[PDB]
RNA sequence: UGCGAGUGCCUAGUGGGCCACUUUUGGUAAGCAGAACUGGCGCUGCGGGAUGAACCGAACGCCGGGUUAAGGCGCCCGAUG
RNA sequence: GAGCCUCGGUUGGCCUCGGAUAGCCGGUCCCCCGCGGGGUCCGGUGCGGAGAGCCCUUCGUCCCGGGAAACGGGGCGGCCGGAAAGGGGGCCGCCCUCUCGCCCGUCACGCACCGCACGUUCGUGGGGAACCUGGCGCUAAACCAUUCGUAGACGACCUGCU
């Protein structure tokens, strides 16, 4: 009756500084800092959790307005808890600064 | 989930690389106390940086010119504008997520005030150096209302003196409790210690 | 010239043998360098102001790492050294204390660099000795030979900043 | 106004490096900020590491500054160096904190669940006695 | 150079007694009670020695910017002894020409007036800092006498009453006129 | 050491160049004028040097993963939080 | 009181000393001044009167026994503290209901939706449309037109007019 899934952050897609890819999307998971400590979430599921105006369908539910784009955590990025997630479709680019549901339900440990 | 962020004691772009960075996650702070930022260098120096700054209006139409703001608030709003997209949509959100104030906001008077430790004068800035604080900077800009902050924060400061002396008081009656209730607790606290709590 | 951890190397080198003389002396240099790679074609750079020799005309006997007879007890080093300024260049005589030789002549080279921004293509090292208790000319290594040492360190200022960022206590620093 | 001095014998406690953790006796200083490193009840080996990842105790053990490992060892038994660490407050909290560590889910359960008829009697005695000094305030 | 430790002691004498509250050190006796706060040096203060009978400053791994404050440390301290102890007496003589300089004390020191300097019409009010006490000495047709217990409060007054009589757009090495110190000494002499 | 080589016809466009390491003429000097070798822009996009002819790296069919050069890793801005 | 459009993030709150960094925290106060302050004394000082932290923890209900409570949970009026951009804060009971609330143990039940996802709150969330039941209280202002001329290119501004 509680929370399943961990707090994270779209901190921006995977870029330099005059180009950008929006494949690869960055991820901030509040709680980890460190690279050696990403290894947890690696394969790991992430959703990001929207709704829009009109209705649709929901597996085992009626249907409501919350939509999602799933994504899975690829590998750690850049030693400061950063890490890379490849989502099914791009993000919209409005969600930068959102929180989105990383899960743990694809699990090894 | 809104952080109040104590400006004393903390240096004027070290804690705006803390904040900046924190606004374009997507989490909601707030400066507050903004006349206790100090900045490096002796006082002398940092006036004449600001100084110079006030001379850099356009010359055929000041009043659309550069908005030189005096309270210490909106120097440090300022330093944060500088540090963020401004001229896009993104960073035009971002700074309605940033709330500065000076002195202290009733809302926030009764809030704890977090500290950053990477921006603090004393683990940053070496001993011997010197330091200049933005309060009393502002004040000799254009800055009127030091005084009218100084009696407010010194009504703030005690009011909250009644408040730590009552949350002693409570403490100690805290602290009494369990000088007299530890024969039936007893079987209550070593399972707290046995994994690594109260000691 | 680069740098990192500094090894002390004994390189030993001669000629090929010629006609006019087939048996050439053996000479034997210690050469400081990161990796043996290096440490030979550094010898023939030293060698090749000393005596008539070149590399091609040349070969290197043997080239090997000699190790720290103690690692483990304090000492003293005296280092000459010869190095190129912006204007002519200077000599000088200086003093560390490592526990290694090498260690010292590592420490050599980061001080040069600070001090007078001589790069490691610059300095020759000619010769590094063990240096007693006594005969030490500058105070800042005869500052540390007693045998009853006290200080605290007084301001002792933390770091560990970034881990958790954001904090109540404003950490204190007298230890 | 300094208690704490770094000094032939000082026993220091390591915060990170690679023996985080252990305690270490000092033997001679090396330069301003290195000294030499001895750890021979601590599973610790003899090197030099630097003043800014140890923290010094409050524990002297005499010997001089130049001990081949095995004074400094004899120095370690007879003070008891082990058994006094062990009994102070300092490293009853550094085991507490890791204690916490290594709390399984059941474990904190049981936490959880003491957390909460600890605390009920708690505040149940405080607001007795917090009603009970308005009694005599009067 | 970074040196490990320099070191200094000062002795006190038996009659005055202090105190310190971390660097704010406070110093009291016969003649008053005198407080200096001595932040900003960065060096410890240490009060030893039973029946306190001495003062010891340190000052740990430092270059020679703060090796100069450890002796400023000592020489505050000693006139804050001496102040309290002795007192300190600035004899303060007026050199005229040709106008005498006519000065007199209006409160009990506080406010000193300058008339006839140069034969001005414009009389000079001067401010004594806080505690310093100003009167005129005998045996002798002008001279004035600051009274006091902080070196840097007397000294400091008798500084602006020297700058009070200073001579505008003229040859200074000529008009030798003005009230200038005499002699740096203290109320008893023990 | 590496590369499959030789040979015959027509044939457009070009015939104002410029810059740079090094050598060097006249000129005090020039983002000046005039020479040698080599490489570039012209004809060429890309990463970097904030911006950009010629600078460093590197040359291009459309994409995914991985890894780098030169540059960088307080924020803008990816990365030493 | 129920249905019905749109907007988006959201997935527990932390209800507060000041300040020092070559220095702090909390006490009794045998002692002295006006609950506050000073001296002295006592235990920590990588902080455990720790934001490396605090509180709540929700699967639920039905019987009994054990630990906690008897002074406690919940259900309408009086009295105070708050203004720098103001707090769903404390005390008195009552005509009404408990040893249910929370900590250990017996005892069963709840679509056991048969492995497959946006589940789980702040949400009586903000805005507009109209239906509902009942109560209480309401009665205008601005602009145009005219006049004025302290004003004025035109707008605009100052005035008067049962």
Redesign the pocket.
Known sequence: ?????C?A?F??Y??????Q?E??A?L?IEGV??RDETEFYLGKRC?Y?????????????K??????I?GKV??A??????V?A?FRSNLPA??I?????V?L?PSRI | ?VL?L?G??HLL?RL???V???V???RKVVVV?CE?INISGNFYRNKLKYLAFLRKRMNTNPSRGPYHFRAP?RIFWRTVR????HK?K??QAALDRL?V???????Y??????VVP?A????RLK?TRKFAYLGRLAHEVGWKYQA??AT??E???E???????K???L??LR?QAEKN?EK?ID??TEVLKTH???? | KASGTLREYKVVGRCLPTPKCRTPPLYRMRIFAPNHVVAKSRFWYFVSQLKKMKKSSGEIVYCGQVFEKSPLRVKNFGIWLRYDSRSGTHNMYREYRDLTTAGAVTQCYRDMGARHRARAHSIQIMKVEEIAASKCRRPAVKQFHDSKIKFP??????????????????????? | ????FVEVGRVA?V?FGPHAGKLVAIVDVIDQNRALVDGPCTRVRRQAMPFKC???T?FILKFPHSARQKYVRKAWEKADINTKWAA???A???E??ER?AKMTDFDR?????????????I???V??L???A?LKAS | MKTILSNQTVDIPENVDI?????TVIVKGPRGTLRRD????????SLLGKKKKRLRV?????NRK?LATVRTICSHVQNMIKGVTLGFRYKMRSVYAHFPINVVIQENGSLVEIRNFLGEKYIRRVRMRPGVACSVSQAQKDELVLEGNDIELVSNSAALIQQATTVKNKDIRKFLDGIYVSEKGTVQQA
Not at chain 2, 120 to 123: E, I, Y
Not at chain 5, 19 to 23: C, D, E
């Open positions: 009756s509680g929370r399943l899934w707090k952050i901190a921006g995977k870029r330099g500084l005059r180009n890819r494949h690869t960055l901030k800092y460190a959703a959790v929207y709704k829009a105006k009109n209705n649709t369908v929901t597996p085992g539910g249907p409501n307005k919350t939509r999602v799933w690829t590998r990025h850049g030693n400061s808890g950063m890379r490849k409005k969600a600064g959102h929180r989105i549901r899960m339900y | 989930q109040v104590d004393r004691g772009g705006a690389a803390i900046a960075k924190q374009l996650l997507g106390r206790g608030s500088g540090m963020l997209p896009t993104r960073g709330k104030f000076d002195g202290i906001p009733p809302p008077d009764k809030k704890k005030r977090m990477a603090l004068k004393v683990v001993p009218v902050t407010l924060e009504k703030r400061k009011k909250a003196k009644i408040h730590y002396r949350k002693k008081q403490m100690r602290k209730v039936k079987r209550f690594g709590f109260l000691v | 360190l007084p301001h002792r200022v933390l770091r560990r900043q970034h881990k958790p960022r954001f904090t109540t206590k404003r950490p204190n620093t007298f230890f | 106004v300094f208690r704490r406690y915060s140890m923290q010094l409050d102070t407050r300092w009853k909290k550094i507490a904190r916490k359960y049981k936490v959880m669940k003491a957390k909460k008829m600890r605390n009920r009697i505040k149940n005695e607001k007795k917090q009603r009970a308005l | 105190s310190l509250k971390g660097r001595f932040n900003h040096i960065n060096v410890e203060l340190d000052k740990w791994w430092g703060e």
